[PDB]
């Protein structure tokens, strides 16, 4: 019914585009020098990332959902 | 058990004890093809999401596919406790279960060419007083890669099995193999 609910579905995707930009990750845990993100999905491993107050990170485990 | 077989039957049981499972059957399979289409399944996975537009989304999706409002209470409780990310794997489950608190069977004949169901419908009574199926759903494909005739997959998913199209060449290289 998504093809009636086609403003549903815009909807949907104005939603979703906010959380899946390119090189931009959202902190999912964070604690004793480990912080899981949620996204971040061309990340290579090994890779910088940057926390928003200056704390540099590294990417070492990238998992299917979640990079650690 | 799994965790879309625990929710499966939990929706199976309270669609069952009262009395909607033509409609809770229609609702899982309108459901289905809801959460197929992966942008609408990310959206509620993607845990970033905030529950409140996740559930916003939820109620119109209820409204303009016009569920059960039990159903619509499951998928509400699946947002509740985080097991959303699994919904593809519950409404896959939620068939078995369904077969099996409606008595039913399903089982596929994969064939060579089509029939004209009288013997489809001696092979669905054989398969049904063999697994004692008040009403077994018969079901077939079309698939070439087969050689001659037909064969019978009953059980929990196929777990049985009596074929005779290619199992008779098999046994003749199995014979003159020796082996």
Redo the contacts between chains.
Sequence with gaps: ??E??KI??E???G??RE??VVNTG?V?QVGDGIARI??LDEVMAGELVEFEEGTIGIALNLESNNVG | DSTASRYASALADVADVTGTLEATNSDVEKLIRIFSEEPVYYFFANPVISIDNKRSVLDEIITTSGLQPHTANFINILIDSERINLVKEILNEFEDVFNKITGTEVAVVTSVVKLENDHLAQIAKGVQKITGAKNVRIKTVIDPSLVAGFTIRYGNEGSKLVDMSVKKQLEEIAAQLEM
Excluded: C, M
């Design positions: 019914a998504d009636i609910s549903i579905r909807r949907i995707e939603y979703n959380v899946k959202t999912l949620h996204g």
